[PDB]
Design a protein around this nucleic acid. Structure first.
Lengths: 121, 151, 128, 92, 51, 86, 120
RNA sequence: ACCGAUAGCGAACUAGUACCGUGAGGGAAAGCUGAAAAGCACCCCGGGAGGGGGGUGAAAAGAGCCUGAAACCGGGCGGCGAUAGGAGGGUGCGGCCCGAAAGGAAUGAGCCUCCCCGAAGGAAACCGCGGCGACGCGGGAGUACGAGGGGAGGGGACCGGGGUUGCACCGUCCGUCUUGAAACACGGGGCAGGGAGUUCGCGGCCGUGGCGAGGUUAAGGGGGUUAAGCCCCGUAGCCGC
RNA sequence: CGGCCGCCGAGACCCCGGCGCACGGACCGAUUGGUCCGUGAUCGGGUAGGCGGGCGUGCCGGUGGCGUAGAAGCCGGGCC
């Protein structure tokens, strides 16, 4: 894992739960996909859970996210591939970052992910 | 032939039947199937019986050369394809039996698709004047029908 | 220079978007030309297309060629290279070349090629 | 812009074979002396004991292909390399 | 097709000269990693082996 | 925002220029008056709501008409139609 | 039809080398020999030891952009460079005491090509 | 280094067979299930042919059997559709519709705003003057604008492309003889397949290669080879001096 | 009719970017060549015809490969 913005190892099952969580969020509620859109979501505080791809390059476009999010105290999780992240988000192209602003049909799932990520770090 | 031109056939709400190599007129078969399409099965059977009995003319919209009109509104060229009606009535009864044995209710069946195609041509010759032998051919017809139970 | 590269890429995009489909005369009239669309030079003595009259289709000319610096490049700007196995996958330049897996390669070898290209950081135009 | 695509060593014959590509859009084919100077400067090779076997340009592509050799000592060159190549290089 | 005897002899000479080259033999496709040297000359003993 | 009428393309007897149109603003009847609108945009609204944009580049004739250049030329059903300046 | 030029890779390389050498040393003799070698094969220069004896002086350097043949008799001591030598011509030159070399050796010996005389 | 079922012998097969002419004689078309028939047991309808279920098979490939193009026909789907004129198309765009992949694109699409430089070209408000007048001259000013080349901000999913159709303008089909073709001059119902500068001898030239006052073999001979490939010899002969 | 003043109107004239061609030059290819550079107001229509380059098909000698995880062939799309 490149060390610029990776902080902790996210297990494969946790990544899969995050992927299906963002899938259900897109299906039912509302999400905000894209790096700039995610950054604005967290800066304004409308987001609840943020998901970051592990295959972003160059790194200067997504590196600032966890430093800027630890200020707002919002849960962030990692996923393996931006390709799969975008596919889950519903766009053919890759999605470096995603923010969920209302986890419709996913309140309990987001709570579980938040608890696990808080325990990890 | 074996296949059907219908796309979304399912064995729960539909029933199908066919006839191949019928010594009837494909043009009149097409004209009759045009009116038979989108009708209840019993109503279509009654319509075919009327056509056979010569009580109701079948309109012609595509192949109507040198055809006289008929009494009533919408006529216009019309005729009485008795042979075609008799041939297609058997297919209609066959599809009714298919639906009944499948478990559908005959009184609620609607003809949602019915089509006619030109089949193989049987060849022969007729002698003409000045030593010319000329084609003399029988055109066969394929008929396909699938009905659905409305609910 | 990336600046000239981008300018010429835009120029080629505009030119090839305005370029027409060069088809032989009366291609529409007969099915024998519709099913097999090509361009053939009109050579008849009275051919209006040969005479090059307004209101008639145009004919290919050397002027329509795209700028040299970006001729034959992918719309993304990379350079296509046809690949049939990992050996020739490895011989590309990730900063200036992209791999197109040959249509005749099976899935068994294609998955290997894709994972190797991911390891080597080489763009693939048809990643499946 | 020279990029090395392959380096091979053969001590049995006592030399190093270098396969590379020069990316020169908008520029002519680089001179042999310039290519040798750039390659020697980058690889820290000995200028007196290296030869450029060939430089090739293929159609409109600005990617020319170069093959070169670098020997440990002049004895191996005087034993292997032909006189015409030595004269062309000018190192003899 | 006909070729002069002297020209054929010169062509054979050139082919024999090229067979001992390093660049051309490798470029043809042969793999010569383990060959002691080019040309590869072997003692007369090789001519008596029939297995 | 001013109103104008799309009169025709820029044309000879039998030649048409698809990317230029002649526009008559409502209350201009001279070259002097029309020349004050040079550089202003012109918008045409499609029946489905799509908007096509051009700009005024020169004054046409002497009676106050102007020339508007459109990247996407008007379909031709805009002839005799209304457009908005600015 | 079109003039393809020599099919010999060695001859093409020699022509290119001669042009580069003329560029490097600022002389025209090598370019002249280059185009003279480039002329069509059916018109390639043909010279004889008789003509060399007729026109060349003792100790002079001679370049023949083509073939040198051994028709005649030779007395002069001349350094002759030619693309091809017939065995008779080479033997006659050696017996007379001259040297039968190539344009490559000629370039190496006299890079500026001063005093070299072209014979066709 | 021949053809691959309209090719190759006319015949890949019950082919000089069937068939035509009194006769001499002329003379076709026609190859392919599957690995194994495992070639559809049973049920309902039908006079029958066959249809619908259900089974066999990796796949019906179902015997009318490897693949299944085009022409042509029937149904569905999308577009137009009974006041509108041109060889059925060309340029530009607008409706309706499609739009996962291969094309760009959330590492930002159309889009909205702002800033800078800008080739050729290039206004007007207003001021003064000339002209009977249309109008022009000097300043404003080579200014606003200008193809294009760059930058910043907002939004967050389209754009490119495709089918049909509408509007404006333009456009009298293809090949051919002919001074002259839209021609009331000839060849042109549609689709598929076949189809027309080949070989030898002599001669004139050029592109290249070998040898060179010399060049070169022919018929043929020997060695070797699974083999007609490969190696050497062969000066009669021919051209030149 | 004798004149005059404005404005429209071509692929013509000017400008910006691109392609090729003819000629010259530099450098570079182991078979006709390749990259780039300089000039073109004095290069860019075309029938008969002459000349150069390129695209496609069967087979053979080599070289490098793909395929029952699906070859050739066939229908509809994207890109060059």
């Amino acid at each position: 894992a490149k060390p610029s913005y990776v902080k902790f190892e996210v297990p494969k099952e946790l990544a899969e739960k995050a992927l299906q969580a963002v899938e259900i969020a897109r299906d039912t509620g509302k999400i905000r996909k894209g790096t700039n859109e995610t950054t604005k979501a967290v800066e304004r505080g409308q987001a609840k859970l943020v998901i970051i791809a592990e295959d972003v390059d160059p790194e200067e476009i997504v590196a600032h996210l966890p430093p800027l999010c630890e200020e707002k105290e919002i849960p962030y999780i990692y996923v393996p591939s931006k390709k799969e992240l975008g596919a889950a988000a519903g766009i053919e192209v890759a999605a470096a970052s995603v923010a969920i602003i209302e986890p419709g049909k996913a309140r309990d799932l987001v709570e579980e992910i938040a608890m696990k990520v808080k325990e990890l770090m | 032939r074996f296949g059907y031109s219908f796309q979304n056939f399912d064995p729960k709400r539909m029933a199908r039947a066919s006839a191949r190599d019928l010594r009837i007129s494909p043009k009149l078969a097409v004209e009759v199937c045009r009116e038979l399409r989108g009708m209840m099965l019993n109503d279509a059977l009654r319509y075919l019986d009327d056509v056979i009995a010569l009580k109701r003319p079948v309109p012609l919209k595509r192949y109507n050369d040198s055809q006289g009109h008929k009494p009533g509104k919408g006529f216009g060229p019309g005729r009485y394809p008795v042979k075609v009606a008799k041939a297609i009535k058997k297919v209609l009864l066959n599809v009714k039996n298919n639906a009944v044995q499948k478990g559908l209710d005959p009184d609620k069946l609607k003809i949602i698709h019915i089509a006619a195609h030109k089949g193989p041509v049987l060849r022969g010759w007729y002698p003409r004047a000045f030593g010319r032998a000329t084609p003399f051919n029988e055109q066969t017809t394929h008929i396909e029908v699938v009905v659905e139970e409305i609910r | 220079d990336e600046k000239e590269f981008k300018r010429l890429l835009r120029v080629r995009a505009r030119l090839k978007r305005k370029k027409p489909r060069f088809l032989r005369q009366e291609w529409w009239r007969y099915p024998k030309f519709k099913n097999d669309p090509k361009w053939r030079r009109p050579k008849g003595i009275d051919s209006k297309m040969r005479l090059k009259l307004k209101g008639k289709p145009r004919s290919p000319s050397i002027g329509w060629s795209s700028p040299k610096l970006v001729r034959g490049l992918h719309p993304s700007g990379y350079e296509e290279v046809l690949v049939h196995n990992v050996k020739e996958l490895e011989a590309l330049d990730p900063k200036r070349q992209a791999a197109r897996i040959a249509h005749t390669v099976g899935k068994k070898k294609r998955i290997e090629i894709i994972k190797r290209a991911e390891e080597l950081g080489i763009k693939v135009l048809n990643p499946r | 812009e020279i990029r090395i695509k392959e380096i091979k060593e053969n001590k049995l014959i006592g030399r190093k074979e270098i396969y590379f590509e020069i990316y020169h859009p908008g520029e002519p084919t680089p001179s042999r002396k310039d290519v040798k100077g750039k390659l020697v400067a980058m690889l820290d090779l000995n200028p007196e004991t290296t030869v450029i076997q060939y430089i090739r340009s293929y159609f409109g592509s600005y990617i020319s292909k170069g093959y070169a050799k670098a020997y440990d000592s002049k004895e191996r060159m005087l034993y292997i390399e032909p006189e015409y190549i030595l004269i062309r290089d000018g190192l003899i | 097709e006909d070729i002069n005897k002297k020209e054929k002899r010169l062509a054979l000479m050139s082919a024999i000269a090229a067979t001992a080259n390093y660049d051309l033999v490798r470029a043809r496709g042969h793999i010569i990693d383990n060959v002691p040297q080019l040309p590869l000359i072997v003692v007369d003993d090789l001519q008596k082996v029939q297995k | 925002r001013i109103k104008g009428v799309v009169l025709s393309y820029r044309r000879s007897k039998e030649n048409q220029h698809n990317n230029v149109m002649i526009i008559k603003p409502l209350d201009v009847n001279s070259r002097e008056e029309a020349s004050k609108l040079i550089g202003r945009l012109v918008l045409w609204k499609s029946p489905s709501g799509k908007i096509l944009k051009g700009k005024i580049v020169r004054v046409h004739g002497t009676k106050g008409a102007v020339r508007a250049r459109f990247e996407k030329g008007l379909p031709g059903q805009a002839l005799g139609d209304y457009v908005e300046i600015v | 039809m079109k003039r393809t030029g020599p099919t010999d890779p060695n001859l093409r390389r020699l022509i290119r080398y001669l042009r580069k050498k003329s560029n490097e040393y600022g002389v025209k003799i090598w370019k002249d020999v280059a185009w003279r070698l480039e002329r069509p094969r059916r018109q390639r220069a043909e010279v004889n030891v008789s003509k060399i004896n007729r026109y060349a002086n003792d100790g002079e350097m001679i370049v023949v952009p083509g073939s040198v043949l051994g028709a005649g008799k030779l007395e002069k001591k001349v350094i002759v460079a030619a693309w091809k030598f017939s065995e008779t011509a080479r033997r006659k030159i050696i017996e007379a005491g001259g040297e039968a070399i190539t344009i490559e050796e000629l370039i190496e010996r006299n890079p500026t090509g001063s005093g070299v005389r072209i014979m066709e």
